[PDB]
């Protein structure tokens, strides 16, 4: 389906920053393993993929304090 929108991107970026994680180091690698495509940039996800990643980041951010 269609590419990730800027509101979803900004929600993901907010959570990455809160978690002390990055696209390059953390999330792009994980998305590539989970979705089994080769994802090399944050704008290259689909909206459906991004929503799945955002749900996972919310769980992480809700679970515990960042050390």
């Amino acid at each position: 389906i269609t590419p990730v929108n800027d509101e979803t991107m900004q929600e993901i970026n907010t959570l990455l920053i809160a978690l002390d994680k990055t696209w390059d180091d953390d999330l792009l690698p994980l998305c590539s393993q989970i979705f089994r495509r080769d994802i090399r940039a944050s704008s290259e996800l689909t909206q459906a993929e991004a929503v799945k990643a955002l749900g996972f980041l919310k769980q992480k951010a809700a679970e515990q304090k960042v050390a």
């Binding site: 994680k21 953390d26 994980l30 393993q33 989970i34 089994r36 799945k52 990643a53 996972f56 992480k60």
Partner: peptide, 10 residues
């Protein structure tokens, strides 16, 4: 296949 619904470390 691991999934975003799984208790994946991050």
């Amino acid at each position: 296949w691991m999934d975003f619904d799984d208790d994946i470390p991050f």
